[PDB]
Amino acid sequence: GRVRTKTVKKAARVIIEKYYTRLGNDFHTNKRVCEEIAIIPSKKLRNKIAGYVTHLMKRIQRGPVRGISIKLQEEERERRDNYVPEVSALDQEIIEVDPDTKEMLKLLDFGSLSNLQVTQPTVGMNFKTPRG
């Protein structure tokens, strides 16, 4: 089995986390890049780390990777969190109102409103799942 160990995988994740701009698709380029940036004592471990770097870069080019903190993907995530639309979906011209909700709003202070719409009650009381 050609299974990479944790000393390969965690070190490769640290290398890609610190030097995402330097690394690339080509194995013989980013192998020498990892040789320059990282102090690896042996060529076999260096080749394992470089191969797992190439595989994680293929995973990054395919999509997002869970156990990594890329600055560009973090900026994209922050942008998608800070995205604000134009008009709110809570502001509606017609709001569907059930009759018991209309009764409790009538017993509250806000009985009559401007933009509500009392609908007909759903006749036929069949809401539970059949057993077994």
């Binding site: 509606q92 709001i95 909700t101 009764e103 759903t122």
Partner: protein, 217 residues
Amino acid sequence: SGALDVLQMKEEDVLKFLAAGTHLGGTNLDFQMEQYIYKRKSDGIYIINLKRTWEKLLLAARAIVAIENPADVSVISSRNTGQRAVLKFAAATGATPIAGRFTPGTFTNQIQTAFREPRLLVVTDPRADHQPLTEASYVNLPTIALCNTDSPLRYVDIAIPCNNKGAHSVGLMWWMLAREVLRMRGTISREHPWEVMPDLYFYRDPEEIEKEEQAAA
């Protein structure tokens, strides 16, 4: 909160409650949550009383504002519905958020790196965050909990009856509680509305994110 015309329920909050569906409760019933329900509908859905929801929100706002340090109020969400909401709530208020993967032992184990000793917990869902309730059972930690009619009140301390399943309802109740605490401490005057729009706190389906990305360009 009691017989005070300033802290009453507001007509701009009524329509947003009705649009988000926070009164739209669950199908089943927990016995502790029976005092917050007005009447059960047809098709088996309890109605959460919005005025009493506003009162529990006001008391939780008291519990937040009474803590002097804003940084040590733990704001926890494990489900994906409230992960954006707790992070933006902590960014708005000044708290320390927990959004997904709550490690067991962050309140008890010293040698762990994320050993925080807060003063107040604000729980998104009881069944989803049963474990922070267990660490708040061993550490002297009061608890705020956004609870449904089905949600139990085990080890919670001040609960707000809400619809914790609807993604609009959760973010809307986070927005109401955030506006209320930022109006209670000296940031926002209550005459003018707050600038930040309630769609910021809502969690987005990635299918809807791809739909908006197609519709924008």
